[PDB]
Amino acid sequence: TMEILRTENIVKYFGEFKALDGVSISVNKGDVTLIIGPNGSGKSTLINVITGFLKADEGRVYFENKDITNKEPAELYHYGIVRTFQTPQPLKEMTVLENLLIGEICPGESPLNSLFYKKWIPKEEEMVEKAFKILEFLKLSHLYDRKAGELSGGQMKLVEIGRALMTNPKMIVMDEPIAGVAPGLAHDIFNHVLELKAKGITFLIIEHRLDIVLNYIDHLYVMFNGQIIAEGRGEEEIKNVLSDPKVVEIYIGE
Ligand SMILES: Nc1ncnc2c1ncn2[C@@H]1O[C@H](COP(=O)(O)OP(=O)(O)O)[C@@H](O)[C@H]1O
Ligand code: MMC
Ligand SMILES: [Mg+2]
């Protein structure tokens, strides 16, 4: 079992505010890693540093040991690191298939980036074969021509994961993919995550808390004030963590 991603004492300031105070995490290939913590604890910031949206002021980030510290999304895409993005409104006017194909212009970048650089949605062989192979995986093949806006919220979320898959990634990073969903949808999204894990794909996900999808998590990290305050590897440890007095205290009123 090998480590696929590690961060070493990542520090990030926003003015005089230290958002990340020396965060060192480790993700192993295939692990569904979840980072939780109260709002403002620095989870999105950590992920933004790891995925090229923010530079680390101090610290190193390694993907397969290759120092990827501070590389933009366009470069990280070549390394096999992708991020899921929320679907912009205009993409909801495009078909499910177009939603998967538009990522070939600005690969690994925000959909707005791709949507604004698009002359005509690419329709090449290997591309369409990839898209349809992904639609089969998500069991959304018959929806290929349906406008993204007419999909259920949950089907739209699967399509967002589908876009990330277009880039044939090694690691998919998701910032709060199941925020606000009902238990059934949370299970649905996470069932597909498990299926993707079986194919060797690694997941680094952020969620506010952990409950419904508890048994889907291989590795857990709890953040607070830009620092890692707890960690669990495995069902029992993860359950210990969630019941940790100090962990529930940071959740008073949240
Ligand atoms: N781009 C930014 N510029 C200035 N402050 C930021 C920026 N991004 C995040 N912050 C601050 O960092 C802290 C939280 O980090 P964030 O990643 O958003 O937390 P979380 O994802 O855990 O809710 C907050 O105090 C937030 O206001
Ligand atoms: C990178 Hg267009
Ligand atoms: Mg956040």
CATH number of the CATH domain containing 4: 3.40.50.300
With CA atoms as reference, report the closest residue to 85 among 139, 48, 46.
Answer: 48
Which ligand neighbours the alpha carbon of 74 most closely?
Answer: 2
Ligand 2 center to 63 CA (angstroms): 22
Elucidation method: X-ray
From 143, 86, 93, 154, select the one nearest 118 (Cα to Cα): 93
Q: Which residues pair with 27 in a beta bridge?
A: 5
Element (H, E) at 191: helix 183-197
Domain enclosing residue 218, as ranges: 1-254
Distance CA 208, CA 215 (A): 16
Of 144, 149, 120, 142, nearest in space to 131 by CA: 144
User: What is the b/e burial string over 141-163, where b = at least 16 CB atoms within 10 angstroms of the residue's CB?
Assistant: eebbeeebeebeebbbbbbbbbb
- Residue 28 token pair: 């192993």
φ, ψ of residue 76 to 5 degrees: the values are -60, -25
- Pocket perturbation via mutation, ligand 1, pick of 11, 14, 209 by most ligand atoms within 8 A of CB: 14
From CA 121, how far away is CA 193, in angstroms rounded? 28
Overall number of domains in the chain: 1
Max Cα-Cα span within the chain: 55
Name the residue at shortest CA distance from atom 1 of ligand 2: 106
Say what the resolution is, in angstroms: 1.6
Give the position of tokens 């894990």. 197
Nearest-CA residue for atom 25 of ligand 1: 40
Closest atom of ligand 1 to CA, residue 41: 22
Q: How far apart are CA 66 and CA 183, in angstroms?
A: 38
